[PDB]
Amino acid sequence: GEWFRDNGKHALIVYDDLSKQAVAYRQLSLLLRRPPGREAYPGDVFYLHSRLLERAAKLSEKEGSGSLTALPVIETQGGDVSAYIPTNVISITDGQIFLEAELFYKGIRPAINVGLSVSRVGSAAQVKALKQVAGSLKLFLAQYREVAAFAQSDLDASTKQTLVRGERLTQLLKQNQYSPLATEEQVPLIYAGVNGHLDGIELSRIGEFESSFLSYLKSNHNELLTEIREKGELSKELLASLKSATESFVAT
């Protein structure tokens, strides 16, 4: 991957997985009779993974601006992020995407636990278009997770609302396997959600909404899609155009 990085290009590397790599290093270390420590790992198993992962980098202009991006995989045991190897890798990387079985069975796929996932880089690494709608998405979900339990007859105005958005925003994030979406397809969906245009639509129909809304936009508003893709930002004019296109489709 470094060949790409070193030559002004950009590579992505997936290590699937680093758990099993540790286990191979531990086999050699024990059979060469090197001293064992926690879980019988050798005292340089941290160094093993940090040597590997700091090789992912974004080079300066002087050095060609090439890039290497790493998606290492770690398998936990019963959700235990405190085990030795997960501890190591977690503290080396720039953030975690955390998957959970409970969410998976719920329908939530990909099964990303949003409260526990982070990207230490954050906004800097986001298409401005998506950032303009994602900013408030993070909030509405945070507020939704606090009030989650209240989901069972006597609930006031504000908390009933947080429940209505939350459920639908959660539902928008469901996505079929092998079906990645362009940014210009992503923003109208999150725009619609975040702004309330989904609240009237029943929870089971959000999936069919996404499909129809995208093709309606490709049929009738392809100019807006094209501006999102090409400019990567949203003028106040775009915002209002989106607002109109969304309001238009919701009623139909």
């Binding site: 409970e102 069975y105 719920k106 329908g107 069972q152 007859s153």
Partner: protein, 116 residues
């Protein structure tokens, strides 16, 4: 869906969602009981309890342990059977009728035998 078909895949997902909702709500049941659940939540729990039981099956080899003649159920009857349940076609049927039987015809048959 590419392998079992879309219909099969959907029943599977929804059976699993019903089951997980039930697992989820088990802590509200244990402390506050069934009365506190929502209208749509009560119905999900009642369907889940049936589904749990419907998934049980008398094996031919397990006959000495049960005294129940073994049952073997075709994949297509399994899908059709569970689909019907998820659509609410057998809501009036009590739990025990789904326990330790074959396909849906068996459920119907046990239900009538328990009432008589």
């Amino acid at each position: 869906a590419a392998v079992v078909g879309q219909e099969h895949y959907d029943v599977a997902s929804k059976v699993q969602e019903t089951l997980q909702t039930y697992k989820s709500l088990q802590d509200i049941i244990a402390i506050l009981g069934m009365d506190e659940l929502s209208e749509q939540d009560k119905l999900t729990v009642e369907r889940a309890r049936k589904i749990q039981r419907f998934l049980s099956q008398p094996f031919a080899v397990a006959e000495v342990f049960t005294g129940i003649p073994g049952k073997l159920v075709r994949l297509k009857d399994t899908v059709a059977s569970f689909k019907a349940v998820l659509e609410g076609k057998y809501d009036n049927i009590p739990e025990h009728a789904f326990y330790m039987v074959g396909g849906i015809e068996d459920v119907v048959a046990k239900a009538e035998k328990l009432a008589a």
